[PDB]
Amino acid sequence: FSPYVFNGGTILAIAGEDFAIVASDTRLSEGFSIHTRDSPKCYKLTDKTVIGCSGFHGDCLTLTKIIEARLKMYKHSNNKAMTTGAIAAMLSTILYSRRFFPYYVYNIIGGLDEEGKGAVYSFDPVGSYQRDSFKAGGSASAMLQPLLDNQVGFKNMQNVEHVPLSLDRAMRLVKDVFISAAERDVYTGDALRICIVTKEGIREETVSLRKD
């Protein structure tokens, strides 16, 4: 009796000067069966933070419910909504709480910090913690994170302008990388959810991907 199943999933997060994009494929399989087509993998923890959970779906759901409950408890205790950094630290503690029966779930929090700039944190199942600038996770992260390195970090491209990426360009980057992901990774595809976090709020945008 294996208590884990890999449900597949691809999530991506890009920070920025004033925005945070958190996107996820909507496909959700249980092996070689596409099974459900809906149920994206990005949750709106608060109007300034969205968390993308990938991997075992039962653990994704339970961890999301635990995070929401803990956000409510913090709100009642402190009379103020959690900041993105506080959510990241609390989630690190929660993930490490089950260090000897880990949540089989890769987490990427993305949202606005207190100063108002974008911020992306990436966690491993046991509860590691790092404030990256842009990170991919899940199954297609292997073929996604390199292109983000190329086009947001300008890696290996000498003699280039280091213009901060705009929201439109970041969205185009996300959509293109996820098109290539839907093509090359069988798990990825079947609709794409985008959550843009900015001072205005959280904008949800859906893009059709390869149905297979």
Next chain:
Amino acid sequence: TQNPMVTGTSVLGVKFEGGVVIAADMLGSYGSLARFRNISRIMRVNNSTMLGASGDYADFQYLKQVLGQMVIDEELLGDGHSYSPRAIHSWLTRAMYSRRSKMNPLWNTMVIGGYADGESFLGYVDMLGVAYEAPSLATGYGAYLAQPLLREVLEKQPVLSQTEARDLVERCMRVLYYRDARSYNRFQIATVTEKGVEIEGPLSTETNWDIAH
């Protein structure tokens, strides 16, 4: 339940436009043996919720007992509040995940059908704790050979009426009995609509064997 002793088989659920219709064999298999055949693997949780399991029948019976007692307690309260199909789905998901984490799983895969507030609900609580709300569900070994038909029909016509939904579930159970070693030609169809839940007895398929001779 580390080892499933006497298991059911695939359970189907389709989102009728004004309700939900699920289908399930009456066969409780013990390995490669029919054993018990006159057992219903569908439960009427309440006026607007119904359940169908495709795993260890003992575990399904335990869950049926627990759910029935919960609904009885709620009715005893009788304060005008009723468990929604989604509420039953969430409670079932939490119970299954809790026992998974405890490493004492309930070896059941369950379709939850319901019709509340004019909204049809269909969920897929499995053994480990995976929970869904897909338009059509085919749990068990019937996923591979039943979900395709339902998906193609739904994509060609997203909204289904009573007659066509019933015909589609009949054809899917037909294919299941055709090519499922642990199936049986006696299946119940339970339909939940605004008027309540009705389980339509021991229906049978009119199998055509001259097709392949």
Next chain:
Amino acid sequence: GTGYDLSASTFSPDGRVFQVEYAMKAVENSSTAIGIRCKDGVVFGVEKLVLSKLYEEGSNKRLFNVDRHVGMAVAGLLADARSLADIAREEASNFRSNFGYNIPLKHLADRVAMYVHAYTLYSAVRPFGCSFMLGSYSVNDGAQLYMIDPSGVSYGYWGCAIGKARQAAKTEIEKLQMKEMTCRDIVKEVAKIIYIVHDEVKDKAFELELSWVGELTNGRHEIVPKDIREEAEKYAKESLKEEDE
């Protein structure tokens, strides 16, 4: 004071535990709840007292559903009554979970009586300050009605009345052929009895809560429908005028 009336674990020099008697006194100070066991069912009526016009209708229900087929009519401290209703609900749930069928009312009454006796044994807890009645009906056992009191005695009954007006209620119930009446008429008789025993110049406001469990419900306890309660109330008022005349 007596000196032996503190703690329910002390026997006075007569064999009397006075805390249980004080609990009985507490129950014999509340509104009146009666219950009559007709041939094909049991009907509970309670003269709930609306202690303020602010409380909405149906507040402080003294008729609980203790299991689907069993109704409970309480009289006394309503907090203790709710706790006992929860205890009886849990006992019925445990019975159905273990043995697999609806709890017999005789057994349910015995279990709850043993619980009440548990709380009257000790000095760390006070005896339950309420009496109650358990009524049910089934094809294989028949209509049954039991009464439990703070001391924990579970005698069966044909007609029972607990609360302020218990003696008068029993007097007015004796003059009934309950053993051969039907639910549809015993409900009206219950309403009439409650209205007669109710005191208007002392209790002021008043609300009649009725319930039956009987053959015409397939052994399922429930609150008497609106129209039936209205007709029984009208008949009770007419009968009050007739008795005055």
Next chain:
Amino acid sequence: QIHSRKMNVSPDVNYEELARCTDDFNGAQCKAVCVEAGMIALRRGATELTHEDYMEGILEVQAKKKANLQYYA
């Protein structure tokens, strides 16, 4: 009501609530409650007695004082 008959007691007083709050007063103590309510209304330049004046009357009759105790919400 008897001992407040000859006063300017406002119609809004709730003698049922007063009887609930008494808790083992004599009839003499009830009369004193009425008298002290009258005196308290005479204080604070009141043209009518009021239920809160009656409450202060019960307080003075028992000789107790009402203070905003700091550990009460």
Next chain:
Amino acid sequence: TTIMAVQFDGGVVLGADSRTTTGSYIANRVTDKLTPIHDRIFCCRSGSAADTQAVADAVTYQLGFHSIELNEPPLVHTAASLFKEMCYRYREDLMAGIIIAGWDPQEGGQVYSVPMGGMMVRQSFAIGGSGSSYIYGYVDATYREGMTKEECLQFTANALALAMERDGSSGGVIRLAAIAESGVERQVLLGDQIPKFA
């Protein structure tokens, strides 16, 4: 082992072989599989003897106490429910499958089968034990609704004879018990009273 129960109007007949192996050696060859739970309810046991006996004794204790407290004869459903609770709870420790058959005033002539696990299914005729399968298929054809007590007795005898004939782990004498209003009548078919080829 092999155990069977058949329901007839107003009663029920249980039957069981009398073999108890510990491998390929018959530790006991006149074992009494049938066990009287209360007075009319009987349980036919299969699986590990220790677990089955412990469960039967515990259920006898529980049902006796329940019936004495209720002042009423127990229900076959109640006895089978106690068996189901224990078996389901201790699925992983109990290698026991049981058939509870009996008579009660309300639903006389009842047969429930709690196989390995915790199932709870009433049946017109129930079969269990290692040698079940063969007679299981045979009774699928032989059974006909509306049998009387004598026809049910012959049916059970022939079925268990077939199972004993074709099963290495079953063999010995055949113990039958007919339960109804009048009570319980138990008999044994030793060597010749049992069919020869059918």
Next chain:
Amino acid sequence: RNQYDNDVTVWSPQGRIHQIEYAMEAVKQGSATVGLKSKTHAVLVALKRAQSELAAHQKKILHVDNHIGISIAGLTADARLLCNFMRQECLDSRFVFDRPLPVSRLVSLIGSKTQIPTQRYGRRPYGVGLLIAGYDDMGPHIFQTCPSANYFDCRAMSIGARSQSARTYLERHMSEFMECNLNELVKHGLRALRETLPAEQDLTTKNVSIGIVGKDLEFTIYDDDDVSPFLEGLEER
């Protein structure tokens, strides 16, 4: 008395239990709070006291899960304990069942929890009265719970010191409720607090708290300058 009111475990020789009555008296040491409800809203309005002109005004409306708020009158320790218990119960219900806990069931849980102390010698009855405002799919609810472990489903109620003025106002004007806009409803609550206020005193933004829940309105607490649109609109005596 004098030997029958030392603990909750002793019945007095009159069928009367004294420490519960003493807790029900403790509920009157709080401050006035009036709850009331239309057909699509529920409003708690509380008169916040002040321990000194420097110290802020003690909060009296607390925020249970989004569809429930609470107004407290009595011991603040017990208020905190019961608020924590209610929050935990609502969270547990929203975790197990993906829906808000019904208010009529939350109040039953509170009743059982508060009744347990009133029968065993290990603690004192919770000396805090509660006005629970909530909005479940049935409709807006106002509940009252008293230290006796008794709860009443009230269409409009008031508790605390100087409560009968507000209760009489509510009895007089409750026929208006139900068919009221939210502003009119809050105005009626503020009028009730005015009635319970001493004549020389008046309702100021400093000492008034207004919690509102209802359809398409998650429980919101208005304090300090948030109550200005209500008090400003309120007519003067």
Next chain:
Amino acid sequence: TRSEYDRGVNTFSPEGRLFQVEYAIEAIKLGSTAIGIQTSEGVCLAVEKRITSPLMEPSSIEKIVEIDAHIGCAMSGLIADAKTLIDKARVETQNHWFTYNETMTVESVTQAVSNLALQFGEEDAAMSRPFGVALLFGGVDEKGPQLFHMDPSGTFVQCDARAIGSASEGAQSSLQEVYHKSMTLKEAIKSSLIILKQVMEEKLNATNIELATVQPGQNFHMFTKEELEEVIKDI
């Protein structure tokens, strides 16, 4: 009459009062006075140290202590209960930092300490009587400088200016007279020391007082002898 109603912390009086909580609040007065002032430029704490005799070095009377780098506590009451509650506050602030990776707000830490204090006889916390100590948590958080007062009953509330201890009733009046919102931290220090000199039987000079301040910036700073003398020069 308060002989069957104030012998235990879980016995109500006919008026509905916890006389044991009353008595703990009374035990508060036996400590030396402490005045905290909240201002837009920070928060100040100033306490009457009550040296009984020389040979007891001053760093053993801890009336002003540090909770994290952004809160100070001015205490009045039993030293033992003071130590217990101060330790709870410190550990709670560190726990919140560990979990959420940020500084606990003054209100939240006061709430945690009050939550510890509520549990007189609640049989699931083990203390059996109210903590006979009253605290002033003056700190700085994202909401600007704040000062909170907590009492034995567990009740806490913010205070633009407060005084606890023996000279509480007679010093809060002076605080009311002299305090206004648009006050600088130097003005608050001067006014607090003036009130302390008013309410002390001993003369104000160098030792016998402690002064501390938490500002939007530098951490909680306890004035040493030099700063104390500089302020006392022209209080």
Next chain:
Amino acid sequence: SAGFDRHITIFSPEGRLYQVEYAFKAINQGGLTSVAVRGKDCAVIVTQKKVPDKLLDSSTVTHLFKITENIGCVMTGMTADSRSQVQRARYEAANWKYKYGYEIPVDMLCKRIADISQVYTQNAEMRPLGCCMILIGIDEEQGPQVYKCDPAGYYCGFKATAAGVKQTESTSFLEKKVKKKFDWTFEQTVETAITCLSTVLSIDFKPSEIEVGVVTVENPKFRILTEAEIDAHLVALAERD
């Protein structure tokens, strides 16, 4: 000596347990009376049955309980305590049969109940529940047996006993009737018990205002005699007396 009176565990300066004595007074508080007599091959318990209301179900009203298939008891005292102790006796008998494989002897069940009561008399956790249990059964080697289990741990066996208000009068009557041909038959034992109750209460019994339970060697199952049997006994024995 009244100070040594409010606690079950305090010895009076002369070594008395006033709370236990008060439990006995509680026995003498239900108003009812019970008598028990054993013949050669039968035992009989007879209890006064009060049903002071037409609305009270006489079938449910009773003081004769079937502790097990072959053991019966008559309880006198507080009804709640009586039923609690009856449940305890049934549980103990079931445990005995489970553990040891044979039906509990009557004397053993009495010793178990008496020990349970002695525990409460020694420790201070409960009050000694104020009921008296008279048990009857048929022992395979001894014969008919009648026992008492008073609420202090005393459980002597009896040729004939009584409990309740008129226990002393019934005891004197049974002493006189047993000094002369203690050898009684079934009918003679029922006669003796019913006559003892009637004479001590100063009343002649209707068939309903009395409840009789019987065990016999030929039929060793506790049987509660029906109204017809009670009336037959009364009429026939009064006629032929």
